[PDB]
């Protein structure tokens, strides 16, 4: 059966490199934590941060939060922003590294909003597989 979860969130919070793991590593269990990397330089993320404002107000369950990799990864040079990552139970129920696979400069609001969907983050609206991963 159900019980109800009950909603703790509303709003996207900002949070820094070595809180990153003891925040989303380390977050709690039936949680969906999807991070999503900006950057002042990359113009996609800007734009991807947009649909995060209002997405944390539409879904207080999923904890939204943002960081620069100002000095997070090493192996990260460039062409891999934007990038998104979505963790449940500390591992990545999907992740998005690239323009393109992030939507694009021309990414609605809607189209994103069943990306973090179909992972199991939210329930939107956008077609949806029977269940690839979810069930």
């Not at 996609?44 to 939204?64: D, G, I, W, Y």
């Not at 963790?87 to 189209?111: P, R």
């Amino acid at each position: 059966g159900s019980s109800g979860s009950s909603g703790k969130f509303g709003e996207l919070r900002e949070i820094s490199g070595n809180q990153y793991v003891n925040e989303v590593t380390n977050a709690e269990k039936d949680l969906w934590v999807v991070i999503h990397l900006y950057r002042s330089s990359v113009p996609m993320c800007l734009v991807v941060n947009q649909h995060l404002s209002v997405l944390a107000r539409k879904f207080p369950e999923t904890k939204f939060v943002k960081a620069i990799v100002n000095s997070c990864i090493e192996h990260y040079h460039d062409n891999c922003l934007p990038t998104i990552f979505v963790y449940k139970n500390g591992q990545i129920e999907g992740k998005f590294i690239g323009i393109i696979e992030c939507g694009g400069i021309n990414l609605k609001l809607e189209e994103l909003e069943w990306k973090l969907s179909e992972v199991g983050a939210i329930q939107s609206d956008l077609e949806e597989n029977s269940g690839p991963s979810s069930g």
